[PDB]
């Protein structure tokens, strides 16, 4: 946990400083409300079991931000390859992430830091 990490003088992860697991869960849920309501992205998830996806994304996002969560899903590149996702789509998604983190009360600078962790992933997500 955060305490035990501080006991070992490690630095505080983004995970810990946005509020940890409960925070990830709040964010991911608002995230998907947003995406699924955007007709520019909606259809990417037409054939998707969202309940499953959401459990997966909570683990992946939590781990990406330094949390102790296991990721039990598939590799990003295998998942996203073939799905015709462009940098345009990726950016729209990142915008919904940023809005969800704003809605939850996370400081702008920290949101920018989080995008700095996620953006690189575009290499694996996008078709290009
Ligand atoms: C870099 C940001 C993103 C991350 C971290 C991410 C992460 C994930 C994860 C963890 C899964 C579940 C993998 C599994 O089932 O084992 C997933 C699947 C999926 N992602 Fe992403 N994703 C990102 C961006 C996007 C974008 C931009 C789109 C489309 C606009 C997208 C569309 C999808 C779809 C349709 C699936 C699941 C297909 C299905 O099984 O129904 N993702 N992604
Ligand atoms: C990908 N959600
Ligand atoms: K695929």
CA–CA distance, 113 with 14 (Å, rounded to integer): 8
Method by which the model was determined: X-ray
Give this entry's resolution in angstroms.
Answer: 2.1
The domain ranges of the chain are 1-128
Q: Identify which ligand lies nearest to the alpha carbon of 48.
A: 1
- The minimum-distance atom of ligand 1 relative to the CA of 89 is 30
* Token code pair at residue 65: 């931000």
Could you tell me the distance, in angstroms and rounded to a whole number, from the CA of residue 111 to the centre of ligand 3?
28
Q: Which of 104, 120, 2 is nearest to 64 (CA)?
A: 120
Quick check: CB of 57 below 6 Å from ligand 2?
yes
- On whether the 1-128 domain is CATH 1.10.240.10, my answer is no
DSSP assignment of 54-115, as one string?
A: HHHHHHHHHHHTT-S----S--HHHHHTTS---HHHHHHHHHHHHHHHHHTT--HHHHHHHH
């Amino acid at each position: 946990g955060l305490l035990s990490r501080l006991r070992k003088r490690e630095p505080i992860s983004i995970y810990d400083k946005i509020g940890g697991h409960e925070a990830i869960e709040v964010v991911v849920e608002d995230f998907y409300v947003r995406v699924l309501a955007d007709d520019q992205l909606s259809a990417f998830f037409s054939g998707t079991n969202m309940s499953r996806l959401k459990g997966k994304q909570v683990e992946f996002f939590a781990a990406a931000l330094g949390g102790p969560e296991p990721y039990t899903g598939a590799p990003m590149k295998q998942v996203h390859q073939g799905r015709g996702i462009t940098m345009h789509h990726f950016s729209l998604v990142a915008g919904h992430l940023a809005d969800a983190l704003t809605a939850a009360g996370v400081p702008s600078e920290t949101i920018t830091e989080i995008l700095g962790v996620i953006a690189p992933l575009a290499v694996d997500v996008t078709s290009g």
